[PDB]
Amino acid sequence: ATQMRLTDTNLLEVLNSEEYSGVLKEFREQRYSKKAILYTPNTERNLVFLVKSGRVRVYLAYEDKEFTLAILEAGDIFCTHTRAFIQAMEDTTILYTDIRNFQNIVVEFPAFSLNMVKVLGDLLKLLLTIINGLVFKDARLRLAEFLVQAAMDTGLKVPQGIKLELGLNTEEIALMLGTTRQTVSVLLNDFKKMGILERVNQRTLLLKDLQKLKEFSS
Amino acid sequence: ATQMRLTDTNLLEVLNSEEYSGVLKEFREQRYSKKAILYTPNTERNLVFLVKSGRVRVYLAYEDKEFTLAILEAGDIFCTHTRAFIQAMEDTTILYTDIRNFQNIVVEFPAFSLNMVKVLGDLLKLLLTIINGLVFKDARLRLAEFLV
Ligand code: HEM
Numbered sequence: 001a002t003q004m005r006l007t008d009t010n011l012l013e014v015l016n017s018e019e020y021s022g023v024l025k026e027f028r029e030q031r032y033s034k035k036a037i038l039y040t041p042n043t044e045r046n047l048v049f050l051v052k053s054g055r056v057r058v059y060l061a062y063e064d065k066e067f068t069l070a071i072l073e074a075g076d077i078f079c080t081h082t083r084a085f086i087q088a089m090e091d092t093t094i095l096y097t098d099i100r101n102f103q104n105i106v107v108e109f110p111a112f113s114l115n116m117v118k119v120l121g122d123l124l125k126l127l128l129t130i131i132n133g134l135v136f137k138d139a140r141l142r143l144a145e146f147l148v149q150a151a152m153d154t155g156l157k158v159p160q161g162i163k164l165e166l167g168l169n170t171e172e173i174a175l176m177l178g179t180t181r182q183t184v185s186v187l188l189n190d191f192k193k194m195g196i197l198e199r200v201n202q203r204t205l206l207l208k209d210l211q212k213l214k215e216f217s218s
Numbered sequence: 219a220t221q222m223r224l225t226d227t228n229l230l231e232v233l234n235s236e237e238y239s240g241v242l243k244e245f246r247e248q249r250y251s252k253k254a255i256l257y258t259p260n261t262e263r264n265l266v267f268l269v270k271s272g273r274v275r276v277y278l279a280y281e282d283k284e285f286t287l288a289i290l291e292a293g294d295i296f297c298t299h300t301r302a303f304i305q306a307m308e309d310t311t312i313l314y315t316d317i318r319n320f321q322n323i324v325v326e327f328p329a330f331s332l333n334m335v336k337v338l339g340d341l342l343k344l345l346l347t348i349i350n351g352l353v354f355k356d357a358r359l360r361l362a363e364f365l366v
Pocket residue numbers: 048077078079081082083084099102103116119120123332335336339340342343344346347
């Protein structure tokens with residue numbers, strides 16, 4: 001798991017399956033324009049929501065700074081009782097319900113319960129991983145670790161190496177690593193000069209030599 | 219105003235309630251003395267455990283350095299297969315079961331998860347507070363660079 005992609009878990013096929021059609025009722029729909037803030041840290045309302053379509057960004061903010069914790073994709077699930085901002089990275093539709101209502105849904109359908117535990121588990125491991133990087137690694141090592149994990153989760157093997165379509169620019173990467181867009185640009189170039197990668201565009205990378213990158217991040 | 223439900227009680231109370239008696243059996247009890255290392259990022263067994271009594275320090279380690287994440291007390295829940303080491307800070311007792319059993323429990327008794335999430339939430343809150351503190355420090359980044 002990474003800050004760019006949480007879980008391969010399929011919470012949409014469930015909410016559209018055989019048994020599940022009365023619980024979808026108990027979900028309200030809301031749609032958001034790109035860059036719209038879905039939720040603020042001091043939301044008075046406490047909800048559980050899932051991304052039906054699009055892509056949202058969970059982040060911390062302080063003065064003029066931000067740090068991206070996670071990107072939520074279709075299928076992913078979250079709450080509103082967090083200190084984090086939640087923003088549409090694109091035109092997004094969520095499905096939400098008040099927490100008390102969600103607490104009722106979990107017992108009528110154990111698959112939600114089991115999903116919500118697997119997601120919390122991974123979230124737990126992701127947060128320990130962010131902290132570990134912030135405490136003991138430099139930006140270069142955090143990037144190397146980010147690439148290596150991103151490759152394992154979503155890399156596509158091609159003849160030239162592993163294709164990584166991040167859907168993120170250098171600035172969006174910088175916000176996930178806690179650095180500037182400038183130092184990220186420098187670091188990708190260093191990796192390029194090492195034979196590790198090239199850029200395919202502003203959003204995708206070619207990992208020509210993953211083992212040398214694995215060997216770098218340790 | 220609502221009545222108090224099992225969903226609002228601590229994990230131990232629930233576990234030691236009559237309908238969860240066949241659940242408590244799933245857990246095996248283990249006892250550790252002050253300063254013992256329960257688990258490392260290397261522990262091969264994938265297990266979920268809760269503190270029955272005592273307390274447990276969760277920390278990251280690197281080379282000769284440690285970074286403490288949290289102290290877990292009675293009622294708290296954790297797992298192996300994280301970055302973290304886990305060390306008893308006093309004589310402690312835990313209940314553990316295998317990740318497969320815990321999932322069977324969560325599916326047989328889906329409301330148990332609601333109690334699980336409530337405790338887990340406190341730990342997540344805690345870890346996000348750490349993240350906030352690490353990412354938004356000012357000029358002390360290169361001044362505490364001379365401290366260490
Ligand atoms: C899969 C869905 C959920 C996810 C991904 C999630 C995630 C999180 C995260 C990241 C935090 C950190 C809090 C912070 O910002 O400081 C948190 C806090 C918390 N969560 Fe959730 N949550 C979910 C559903 C629920 C549910 C159903 C409950 C049941 C009531 C719950 C109860 C809590 C509580 C009680 C806190 C701490 C706040 C307090 O009461 O003092 N969460 N959650």
